[PDB]
Short mmCIF file of C-alpha atoms in Angstrom, two decimals:
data_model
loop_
_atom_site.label_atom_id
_atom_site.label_comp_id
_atom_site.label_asym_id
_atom_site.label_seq_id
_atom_site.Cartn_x
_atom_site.Cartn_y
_atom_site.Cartn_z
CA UNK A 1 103.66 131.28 122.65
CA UNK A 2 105.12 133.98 120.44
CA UNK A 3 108.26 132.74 121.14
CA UNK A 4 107.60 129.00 120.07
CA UNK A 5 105.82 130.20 116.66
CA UNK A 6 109.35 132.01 116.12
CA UNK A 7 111.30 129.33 116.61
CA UNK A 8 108.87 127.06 115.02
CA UNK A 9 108.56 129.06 111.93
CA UNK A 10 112.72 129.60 112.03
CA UNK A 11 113.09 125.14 111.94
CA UNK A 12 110.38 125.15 108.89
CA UNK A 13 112.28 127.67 106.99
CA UNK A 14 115.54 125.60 107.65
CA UNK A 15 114.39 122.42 106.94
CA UNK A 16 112.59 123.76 103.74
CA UNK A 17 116.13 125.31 102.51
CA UNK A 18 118.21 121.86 103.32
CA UNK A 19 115.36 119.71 101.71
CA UNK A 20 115.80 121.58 98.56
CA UNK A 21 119.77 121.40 98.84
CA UNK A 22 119.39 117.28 98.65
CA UNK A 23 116.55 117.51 95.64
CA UNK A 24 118.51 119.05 93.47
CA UNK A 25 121.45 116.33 93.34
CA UNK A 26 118.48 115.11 91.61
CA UNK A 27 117.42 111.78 94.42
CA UNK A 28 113.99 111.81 93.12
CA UNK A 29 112.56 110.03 96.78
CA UNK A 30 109.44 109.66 96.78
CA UNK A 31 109.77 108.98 92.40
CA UNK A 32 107.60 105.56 92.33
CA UNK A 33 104.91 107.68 94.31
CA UNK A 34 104.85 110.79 91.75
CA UNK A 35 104.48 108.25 89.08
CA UNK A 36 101.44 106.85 90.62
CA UNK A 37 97.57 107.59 88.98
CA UNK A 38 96.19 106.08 91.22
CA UNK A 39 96.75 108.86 94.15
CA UNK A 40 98.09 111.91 93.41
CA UNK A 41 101.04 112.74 95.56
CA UNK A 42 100.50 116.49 95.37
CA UNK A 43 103.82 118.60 95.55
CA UNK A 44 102.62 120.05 98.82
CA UNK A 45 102.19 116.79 100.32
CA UNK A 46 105.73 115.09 99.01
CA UNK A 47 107.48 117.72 101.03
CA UNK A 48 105.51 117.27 104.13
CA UNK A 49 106.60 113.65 103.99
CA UNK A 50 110.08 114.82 103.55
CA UNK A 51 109.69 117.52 106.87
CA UNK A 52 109.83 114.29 108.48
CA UNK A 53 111.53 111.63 106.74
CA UNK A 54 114.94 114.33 106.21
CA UNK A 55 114.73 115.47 109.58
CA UNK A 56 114.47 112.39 111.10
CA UNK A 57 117.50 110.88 109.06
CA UNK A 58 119.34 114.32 109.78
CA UNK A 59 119.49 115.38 106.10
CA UNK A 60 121.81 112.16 105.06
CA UNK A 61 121.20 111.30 101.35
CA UNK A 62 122.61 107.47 101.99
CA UNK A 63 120.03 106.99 104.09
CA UNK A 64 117.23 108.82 102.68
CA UNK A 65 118.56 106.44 99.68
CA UNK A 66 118.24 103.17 101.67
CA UNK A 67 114.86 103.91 102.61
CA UNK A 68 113.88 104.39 99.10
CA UNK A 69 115.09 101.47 98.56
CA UNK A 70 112.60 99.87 101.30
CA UNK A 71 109.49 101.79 100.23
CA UNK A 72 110.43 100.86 96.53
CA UNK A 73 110.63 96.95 97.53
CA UNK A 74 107.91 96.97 99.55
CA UNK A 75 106.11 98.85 96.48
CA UNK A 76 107.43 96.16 93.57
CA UNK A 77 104.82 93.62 95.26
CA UNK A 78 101.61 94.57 94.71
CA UNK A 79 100.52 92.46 97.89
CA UNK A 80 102.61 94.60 100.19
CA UNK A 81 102.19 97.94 97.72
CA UNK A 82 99.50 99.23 100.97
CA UNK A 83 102.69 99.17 103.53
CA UNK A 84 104.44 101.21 101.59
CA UNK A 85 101.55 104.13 101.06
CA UNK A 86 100.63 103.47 104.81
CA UNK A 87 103.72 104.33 105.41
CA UNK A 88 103.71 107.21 104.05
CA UNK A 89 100.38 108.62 103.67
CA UNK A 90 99.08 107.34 107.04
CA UNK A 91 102.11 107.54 109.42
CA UNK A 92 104.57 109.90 108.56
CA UNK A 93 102.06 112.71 106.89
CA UNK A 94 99.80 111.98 110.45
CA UNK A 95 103.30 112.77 112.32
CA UNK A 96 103.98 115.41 109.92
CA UNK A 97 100.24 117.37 109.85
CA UNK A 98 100.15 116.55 113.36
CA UNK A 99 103.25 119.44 113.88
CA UNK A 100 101.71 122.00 111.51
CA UNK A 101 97.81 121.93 113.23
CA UNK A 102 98.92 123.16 116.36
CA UNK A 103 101.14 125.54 114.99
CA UNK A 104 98.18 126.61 113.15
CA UNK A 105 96.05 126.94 116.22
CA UNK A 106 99.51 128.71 117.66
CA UNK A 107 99.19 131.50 115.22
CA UNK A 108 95.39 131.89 116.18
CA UNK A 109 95.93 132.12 119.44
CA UNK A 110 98.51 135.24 118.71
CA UNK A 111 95.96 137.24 116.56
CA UNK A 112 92.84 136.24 118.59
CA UNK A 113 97.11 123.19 126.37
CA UNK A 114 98.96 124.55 123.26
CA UNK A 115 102.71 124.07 124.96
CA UNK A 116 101.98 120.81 125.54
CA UNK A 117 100.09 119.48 122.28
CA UNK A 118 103.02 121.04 120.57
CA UNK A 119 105.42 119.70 122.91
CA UNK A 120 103.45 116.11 121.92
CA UNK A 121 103.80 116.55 118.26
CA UNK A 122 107.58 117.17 118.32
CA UNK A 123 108.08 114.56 120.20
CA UNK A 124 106.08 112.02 118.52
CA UNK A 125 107.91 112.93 115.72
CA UNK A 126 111.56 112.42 117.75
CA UNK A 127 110.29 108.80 118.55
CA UNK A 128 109.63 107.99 114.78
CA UNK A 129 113.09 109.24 113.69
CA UNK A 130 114.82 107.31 116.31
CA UNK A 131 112.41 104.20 115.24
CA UNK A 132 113.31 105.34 111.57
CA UNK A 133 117.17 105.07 111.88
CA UNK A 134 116.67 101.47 114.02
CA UNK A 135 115.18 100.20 110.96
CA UNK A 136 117.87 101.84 108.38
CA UNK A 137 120.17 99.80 110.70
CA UNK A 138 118.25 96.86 110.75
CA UNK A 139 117.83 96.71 106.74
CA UNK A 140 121.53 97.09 106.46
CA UNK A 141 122.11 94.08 108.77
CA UNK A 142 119.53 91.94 106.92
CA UNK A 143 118.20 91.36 110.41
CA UNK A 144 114.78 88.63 110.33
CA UNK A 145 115.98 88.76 106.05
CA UNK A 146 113.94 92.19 106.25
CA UNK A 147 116.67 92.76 103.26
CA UNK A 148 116.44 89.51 101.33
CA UNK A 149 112.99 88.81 101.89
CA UNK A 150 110.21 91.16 101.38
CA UNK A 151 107.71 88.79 103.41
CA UNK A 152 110.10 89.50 106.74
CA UNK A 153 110.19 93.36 105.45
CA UNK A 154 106.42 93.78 105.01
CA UNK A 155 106.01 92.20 108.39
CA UNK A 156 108.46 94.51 110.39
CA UNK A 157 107.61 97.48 108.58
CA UNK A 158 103.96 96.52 109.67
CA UNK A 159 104.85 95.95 113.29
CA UNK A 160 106.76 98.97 113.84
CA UNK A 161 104.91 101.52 112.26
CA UNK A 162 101.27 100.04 113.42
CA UNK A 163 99.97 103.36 114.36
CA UNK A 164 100.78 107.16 115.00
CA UNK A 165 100.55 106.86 118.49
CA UNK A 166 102.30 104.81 119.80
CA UNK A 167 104.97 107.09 118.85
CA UNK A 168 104.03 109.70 120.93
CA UNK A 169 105.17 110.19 124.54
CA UNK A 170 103.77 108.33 127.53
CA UNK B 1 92.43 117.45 92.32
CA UNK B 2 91.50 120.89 92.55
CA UNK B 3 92.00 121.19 96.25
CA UNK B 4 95.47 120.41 95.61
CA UNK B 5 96.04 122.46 93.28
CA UNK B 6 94.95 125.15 95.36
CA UNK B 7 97.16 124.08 98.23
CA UNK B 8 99.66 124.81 95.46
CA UNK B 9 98.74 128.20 94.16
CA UNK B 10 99.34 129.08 97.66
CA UNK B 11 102.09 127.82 98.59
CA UNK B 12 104.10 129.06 95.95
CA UNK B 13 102.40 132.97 95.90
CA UNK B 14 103.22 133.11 99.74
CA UNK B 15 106.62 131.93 99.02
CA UNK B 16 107.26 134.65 95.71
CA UNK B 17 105.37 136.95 98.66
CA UNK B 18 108.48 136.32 101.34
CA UNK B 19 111.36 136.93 98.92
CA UNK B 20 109.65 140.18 97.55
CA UNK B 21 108.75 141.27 100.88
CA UNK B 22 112.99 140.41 102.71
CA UNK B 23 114.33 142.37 99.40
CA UNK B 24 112.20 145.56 100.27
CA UNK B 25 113.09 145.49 103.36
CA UNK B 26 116.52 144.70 103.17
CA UNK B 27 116.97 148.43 102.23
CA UNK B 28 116.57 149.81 105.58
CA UNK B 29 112.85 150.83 105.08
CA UNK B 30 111.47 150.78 108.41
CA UNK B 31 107.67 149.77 107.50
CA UNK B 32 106.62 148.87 110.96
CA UNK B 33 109.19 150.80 113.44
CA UNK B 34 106.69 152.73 115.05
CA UNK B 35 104.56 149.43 115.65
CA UNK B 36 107.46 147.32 117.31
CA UNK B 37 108.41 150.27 119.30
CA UNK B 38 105.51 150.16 121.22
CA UNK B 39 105.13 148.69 124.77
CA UNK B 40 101.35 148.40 125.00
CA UNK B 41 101.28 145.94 121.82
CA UNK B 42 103.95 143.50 121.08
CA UNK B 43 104.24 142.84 117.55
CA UNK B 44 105.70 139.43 116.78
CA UNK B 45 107.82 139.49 113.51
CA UNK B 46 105.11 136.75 112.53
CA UNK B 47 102.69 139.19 112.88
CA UNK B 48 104.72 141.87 111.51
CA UNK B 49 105.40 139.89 108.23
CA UNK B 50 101.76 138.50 107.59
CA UNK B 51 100.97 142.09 107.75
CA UNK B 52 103.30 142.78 105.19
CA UNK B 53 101.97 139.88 103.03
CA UNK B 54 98.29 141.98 102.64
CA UNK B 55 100.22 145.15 102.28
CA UNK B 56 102.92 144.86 100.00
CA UNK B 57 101.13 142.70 97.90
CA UNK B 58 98.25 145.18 97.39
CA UNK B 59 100.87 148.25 97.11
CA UNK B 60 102.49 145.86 94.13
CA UNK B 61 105.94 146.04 96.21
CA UNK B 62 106.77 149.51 95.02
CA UNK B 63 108.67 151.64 98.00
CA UNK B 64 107.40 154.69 97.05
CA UNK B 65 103.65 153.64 97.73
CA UNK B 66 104.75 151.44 101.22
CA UNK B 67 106.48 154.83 102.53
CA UNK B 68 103.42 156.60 101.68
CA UNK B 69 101.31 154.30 103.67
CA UNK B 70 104.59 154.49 106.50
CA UNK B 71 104.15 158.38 106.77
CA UNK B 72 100.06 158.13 107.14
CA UNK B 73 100.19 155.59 109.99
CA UNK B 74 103.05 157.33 111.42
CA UNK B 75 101.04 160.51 111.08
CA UNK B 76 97.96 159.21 113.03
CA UNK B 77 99.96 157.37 115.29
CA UNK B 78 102.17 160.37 116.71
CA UNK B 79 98.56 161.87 117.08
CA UNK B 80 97.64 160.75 120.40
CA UNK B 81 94.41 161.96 119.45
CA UNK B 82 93.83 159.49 116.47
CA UNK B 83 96.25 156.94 117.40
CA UNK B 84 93.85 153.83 117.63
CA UNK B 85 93.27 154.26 113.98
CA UNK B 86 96.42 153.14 113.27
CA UNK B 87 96.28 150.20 114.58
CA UNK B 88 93.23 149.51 113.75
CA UNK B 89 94.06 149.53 110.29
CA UNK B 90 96.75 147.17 111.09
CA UNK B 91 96.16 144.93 113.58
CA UNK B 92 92.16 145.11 112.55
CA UNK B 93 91.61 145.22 109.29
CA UNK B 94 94.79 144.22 107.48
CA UNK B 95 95.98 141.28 109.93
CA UNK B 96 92.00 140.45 109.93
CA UNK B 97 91.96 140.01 106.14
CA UNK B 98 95.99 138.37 106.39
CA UNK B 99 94.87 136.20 108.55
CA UNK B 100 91.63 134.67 106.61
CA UNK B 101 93.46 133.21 104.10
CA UNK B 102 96.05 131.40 106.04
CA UNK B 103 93.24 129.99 107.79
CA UNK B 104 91.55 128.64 104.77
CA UNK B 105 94.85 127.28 103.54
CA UNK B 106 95.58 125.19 107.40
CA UNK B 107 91.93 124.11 106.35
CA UNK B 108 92.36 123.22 102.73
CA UNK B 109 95.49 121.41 104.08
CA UNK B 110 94.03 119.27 106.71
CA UNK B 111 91.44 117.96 104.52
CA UNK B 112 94.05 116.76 101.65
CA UNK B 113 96.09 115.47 104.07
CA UNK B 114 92.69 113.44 106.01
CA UNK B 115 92.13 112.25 102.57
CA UNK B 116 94.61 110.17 102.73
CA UNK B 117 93.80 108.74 105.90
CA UNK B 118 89.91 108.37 104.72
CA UNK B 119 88.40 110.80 107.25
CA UNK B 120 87.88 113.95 105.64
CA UNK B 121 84.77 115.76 106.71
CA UNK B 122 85.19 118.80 105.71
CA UNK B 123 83.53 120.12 102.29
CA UNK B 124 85.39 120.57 99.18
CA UNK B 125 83.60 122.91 97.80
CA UNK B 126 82.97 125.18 100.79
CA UNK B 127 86.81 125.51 101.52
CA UNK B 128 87.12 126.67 97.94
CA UNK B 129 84.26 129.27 97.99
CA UNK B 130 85.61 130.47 101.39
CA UNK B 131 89.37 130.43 99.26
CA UNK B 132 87.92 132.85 96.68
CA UNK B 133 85.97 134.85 99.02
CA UNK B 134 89.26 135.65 101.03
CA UNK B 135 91.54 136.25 98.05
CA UNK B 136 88.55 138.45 96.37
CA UNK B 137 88.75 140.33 100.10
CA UNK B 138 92.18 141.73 100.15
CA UNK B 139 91.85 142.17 96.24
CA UNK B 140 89.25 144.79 97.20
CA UNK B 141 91.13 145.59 100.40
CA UNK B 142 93.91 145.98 97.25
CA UNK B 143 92.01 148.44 95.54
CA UNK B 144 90.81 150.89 98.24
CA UNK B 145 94.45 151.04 99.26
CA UNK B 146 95.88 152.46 95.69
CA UNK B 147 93.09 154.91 96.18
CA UNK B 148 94.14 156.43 99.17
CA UNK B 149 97.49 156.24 98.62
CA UNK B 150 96.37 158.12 95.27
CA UNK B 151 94.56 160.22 97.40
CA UNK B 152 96.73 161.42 99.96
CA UNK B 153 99.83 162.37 97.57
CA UNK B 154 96.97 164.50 95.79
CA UNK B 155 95.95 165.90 99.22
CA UNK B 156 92.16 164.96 98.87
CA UNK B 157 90.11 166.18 101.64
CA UNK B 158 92.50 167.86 103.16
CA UNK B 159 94.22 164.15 103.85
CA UNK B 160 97.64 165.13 103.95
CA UNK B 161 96.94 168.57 105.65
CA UNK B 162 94.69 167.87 108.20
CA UNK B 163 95.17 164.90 110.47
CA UNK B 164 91.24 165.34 111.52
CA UNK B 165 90.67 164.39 108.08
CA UNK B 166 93.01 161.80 107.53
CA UNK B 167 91.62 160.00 110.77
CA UNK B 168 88.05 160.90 109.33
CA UNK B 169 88.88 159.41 105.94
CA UNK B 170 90.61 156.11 106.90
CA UNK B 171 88.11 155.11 109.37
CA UNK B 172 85.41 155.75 106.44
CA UNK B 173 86.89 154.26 103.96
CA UNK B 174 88.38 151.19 106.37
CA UNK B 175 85.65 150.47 108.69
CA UNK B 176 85.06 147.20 109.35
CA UNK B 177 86.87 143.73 108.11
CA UNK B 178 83.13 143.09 105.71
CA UNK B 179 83.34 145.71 104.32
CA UNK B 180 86.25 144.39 101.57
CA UNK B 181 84.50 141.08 101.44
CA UNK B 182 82.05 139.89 98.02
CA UNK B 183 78.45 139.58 97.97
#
């Protein structure tokens, strides 16, 4: 238990240190969501996002790029603006916050089913990064027009990213 | 939103906390040697550093006032006699008043992050009042500790002297977690 809080804490730190490394080539990626008055996309909360989103396309700035690009799209309609924050603030901060609770409850446990709900998290978040680069793939393919039609794009983004768990393992 | 801007305040004075703390430590100060070196007790380096966090902060990261602190838990540690008071201090009372906050902050995290989703239960107001209670904790926690490391380099009560009265002293003046906490 110790030892998985170690590590744990060790892959925050690391991620932390490489998400900074890609910010300051100045990719502002989650930009059209800072701008927004609507919500306020709190700084603690756009680097949550990015935990996942970096990690699960293994720090590469093309990609991060293309799915700006997708989010951004998806955003420029204001009938499919929803997917885009779903995205977002539903699945990928869920996956995210999901991680950090039990590492929370981790840390309690040390100063007062753990393994296992933190075994879940990780992986639920391995299943979203493999469904992650599957759609950077598709998008670059302009597989069912998901790249020339925004329709096709809102509808795929919708269908594979319906809920948090169904990412997580059987 | 003010719970986000707490989330905030928090995140960036545990961060300016870490870099303080690694730099202190980098020169070969051995804070918590004694600690680690015990069997009985195994002290993560989690552990070790949220300590650190309540300590260092309150000591205002000068060496002179950390090795002060070093050479009276090392004192009542290498007296058998009084070596639960120690710890007590530590593991007790400072990781007790550590580890408040960083519960309050999972807390005040959960509930921005459930806003989003549209299921936040939790009260805004009581996670903030339970913030500022913590914070005002360890600020008093804070203050009692300049006063006896004030105290002992001044040899009051025959606290650097007499280990009977160091023990005597310290369990006085750090008796239970409350005690440090508003009303």
């Amino acid at each position: 238990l110790e030892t998985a809080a170690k590590n744990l804490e060790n892959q925050n730190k690391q991620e932390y240190i490489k998400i900074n490394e890609i910010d300051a080539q100045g990719i502002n990626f989650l930009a059209t969501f800072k701008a927004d008055e609507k919500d306020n996309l709190s700084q603690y909360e756009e680097m949550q996002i990015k935990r996942t989103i970096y990690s699960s396309l293994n720090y590469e700035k093309q990609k991060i790029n293309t799915l700006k690009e997708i989010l951004e799209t998806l955003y420029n309609k204001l009938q499919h603006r929803y997917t885009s924050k779903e995205f977002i603030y539903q699945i990928v901060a869920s996956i995210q916050y999901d991680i950090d609770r039990v590492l929370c409850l981790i840390k309690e446990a040390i100063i007062k089913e753990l393994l296992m709900n933190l075994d879940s998290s990780l992986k639920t978040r391995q299943n979203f990064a493999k469904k992650l680069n599957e759609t950077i793939d598709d998008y670059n393919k302009d597989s069912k027009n998901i790249q020339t039609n925004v329709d096709a794009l809102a509808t795929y983004m919708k269908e594979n990213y319906k809920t948090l768990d169904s990412f997580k393992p059987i």
